[PDB]
Design an enzyme around this catalytic site. Structure first.
Site, PDB file in Angstrom:
ATOM      1  N   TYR A  81     -12.099  -6.929   0.403  1.00  0.00           N
ATOM      2  CA  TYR A  81     -12.291  -5.456   0.529  1.00  0.00           C
ATOM      3  C   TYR A  81     -13.720  -4.945   0.277  1.00  0.00           C
ATOM      4  O   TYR A  81     -14.595  -5.481  -0.383  1.00  0.00           O
ATOM      5  CB  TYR A  81     -11.313  -4.779  -0.482  1.00  0.00           C
ATOM      6  CG  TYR A  81     -10.721  -3.472  -0.002  1.00  0.00           C
ATOM      7  CD1 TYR A  81      -9.624  -3.358   0.804  1.00  0.00           C
ATOM      8  CD2 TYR A  81     -11.293  -2.255  -0.456  1.00  0.00           C
ATOM      9  CE1 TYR A  81      -9.105  -2.140   1.178  1.00  0.00           C
ATOM     10  CE2 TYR A  81     -10.788  -1.000  -0.098  1.00  0.00           C
ATOM     11  CZ  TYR A  81      -9.708  -0.961   0.714  1.00  0.00           C
ATOM     12  OH  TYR A  81      -9.167   0.283   1.015  1.00  0.00           O
ATOM     13  N   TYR A 124      -7.304   3.468   0.398  1.00  0.00           N
ATOM     14  CA  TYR A 124      -6.786   4.328   1.418  1.00  0.00           C
ATOM     15  C   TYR A 124      -6.076   5.543   0.935  1.00  0.00           C
ATOM     16  O   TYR A 124      -6.275   6.594   1.557  1.00  0.00           O
ATOM     17  CB  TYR A 124      -5.780   3.642   2.263  1.00  0.00           C
ATOM     18  CG  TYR A 124      -6.208   2.507   3.143  1.00  0.00           C
ATOM     19  CD1 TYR A 124      -7.358   2.576   3.888  1.00  0.00           C
ATOM     20  CD2 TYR A 124      -5.488   1.351   3.106  1.00  0.00           C
ATOM     21  CE1 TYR A 124      -7.744   1.491   4.621  1.00  0.00           C
ATOM     22  CE2 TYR A 124      -5.883   0.253   3.755  1.00  0.00           C
ATOM     23  CZ  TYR A 124      -7.033   0.322   4.500  1.00  0.00           C
ATOM     24  OH  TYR A 124      -7.468  -0.828   5.054  1.00  0.00           O
ATOM     25  N   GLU A 178      -9.473  -5.855   7.124  1.00  0.00           N
ATOM     26  CA  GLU A 178      -8.159  -5.965   7.626  1.00  0.00           C
ATOM     27  C   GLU A 178      -8.099  -6.769   8.893  1.00  0.00           C
ATOM     28  O   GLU A 178      -7.198  -7.598   9.056  1.00  0.00           O
ATOM     29  CB  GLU A 178      -7.745  -4.612   7.825  1.00  0.00           C
ATOM     30  CG  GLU A 178      -6.506  -4.093   7.169  1.00  0.00           C
ATOM     31  CD  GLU A 178      -6.302  -4.200   5.693  1.00  0.00           C
ATOM     32  OE1 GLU A 178      -5.749  -5.247   5.285  1.00  0.00           O
ATOM     33  OE2 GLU A 178      -6.597  -3.295   4.909  1.00  0.00           O
ATOM     34  N   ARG A 181      -8.234 -10.216   7.213  1.00  0.00           N
ATOM     35  CA  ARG A 181      -6.991 -10.597   6.512  1.00  0.00           C
ATOM     36  C   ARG A 181      -5.859 -10.968   7.448  1.00  0.00           C
ATOM     37  O   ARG A 181      -5.083 -11.851   7.221  1.00  0.00           O
ATOM     38  CB  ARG A 181      -6.593  -9.499   5.622  1.00  0.00           C
ATOM     39  CG  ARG A 181      -7.557  -9.302   4.424  1.00  0.00           C
ATOM     40  CD  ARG A 181      -7.225  -7.903   3.913  1.00  0.00           C
ATOM     41  NE  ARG A 181      -7.634  -7.627   2.549  1.00  0.00           N
ATOM     42  CZ  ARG A 181      -7.357  -6.454   2.054  1.00  0.00           C
ATOM     43  NH1 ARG A 181      -6.668  -5.557   2.684  1.00  0.00           N
ATOM     44  NH2 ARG A 181      -7.717  -6.277   0.822  1.00  0.00           N
TER      45      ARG A 181
END
EC number: 3.2.2.22
Length: 268
Positions: A81, A124, A178, A181
């Site tokens: 992240y 988020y 993302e 991931r």
């Protein structure tokens, strides 16, 4: 004055991006966050936060635009992240969640004049309230990254506006942390780049993002594949289906967060 190790910089430009650039960038990013092999039911696990030494901790990611303005994103190798960025001569960090990260982050862009930590964090959930828009309504694709990058760069000079600054980290995180991931979310993004579309993530993207630590525990605790109990996931139209097994997810998830430990390894 100079300093305790330089972090890997991986580059991407939205300038003449294609399904190829994008793929070649996400496999370079996947490759620098995992030190090859803690590989658990075929899926790689990313380094544990406990004896991971600051000079091995981050990755830096340069993003440049058609019209040569660039931003440098710092990614945490332990959960992939975004922790903060640099544009110009200033660096912004999200608000850390604990003392140990508060100090890993002092190592990050120490050669910039001016350095600020937001009052807010990068999840988020806070960032959607700042943007004024849920992830479901924020569009993804190459044009949204061209834009995300100019906005993270004019925040330095004061061209600012929070709604728009938090809008653009939602997009940079999903197009990078993302897509890395999940093999699934990188296919969603290259479908947008092949066809020149910009669109919001549908409900399979959004549940996968929200479930990445639940699937990671589920898979580390699996009784050699079988989930101790089923995980409910969602289709592009909103339906709920459960996965009972790691099999179906090997094509879908690329990297997992460390939640617990082996004893031998049996993988040689």
């Amino acid at each position: 004055m100079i300093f305790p190790k330089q972090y890997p910089i991986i580059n991407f430009t939205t300038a003449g991006a294609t399904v190829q650039s994008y793929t070649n960038f996400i496999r370079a990013v996947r490759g620098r966050l995992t030190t090859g092999a803690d590989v658990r039911h075929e899926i790689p696990v990313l380094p544990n936060r406990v004896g991971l030494p600051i000079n091995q901790r981050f990755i830096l990611v340069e993003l440049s635009n058609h019209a040569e303005l660039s931003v440098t994103l710092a990614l945490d190798v332990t959960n992939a992240y975004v922790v903060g960025y640099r544009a110009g001569n200033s660096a912004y960090f999200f608000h850390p969640d604990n003392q140990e990260d508060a100090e890993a982050i002092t190592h990050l862009f120490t050669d910039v004049q001016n350095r600020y930590t937001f009052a807010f964090g990068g999840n988020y959930d806070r960032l959607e309230q700042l943007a004024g828009n849920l992830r479901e309504n924020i569009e993804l694709g190459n044009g949204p990254l061209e834009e995300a990058i100019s906005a993270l760069y004019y925040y330095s000079t004061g061209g600012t506006q929070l709604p728009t600054l938090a809008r653009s980290f939602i997009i940079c995180i999903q197009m990078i942390s993302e897509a890395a991931r999940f093999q699934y979310i990188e296919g969603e993004m290259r479908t947008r780049i092949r066809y020149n579309r910009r669109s919001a993530p549908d409900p399979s993207v959004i549940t996968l993002e929200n479930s990445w630590g639940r699937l990671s525990t589920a898979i580390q605790e699996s009784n050699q594949g079988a989930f101790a109990s089923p995980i409910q996931l969602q289709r592009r139209n909103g339906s709920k289906f459960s996965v009972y097994d790691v099999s179906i997810l090997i094509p879908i998830i690329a990297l997992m967060v460390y939640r617990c430990a082996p004893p031998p390894s049996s993988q040689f």
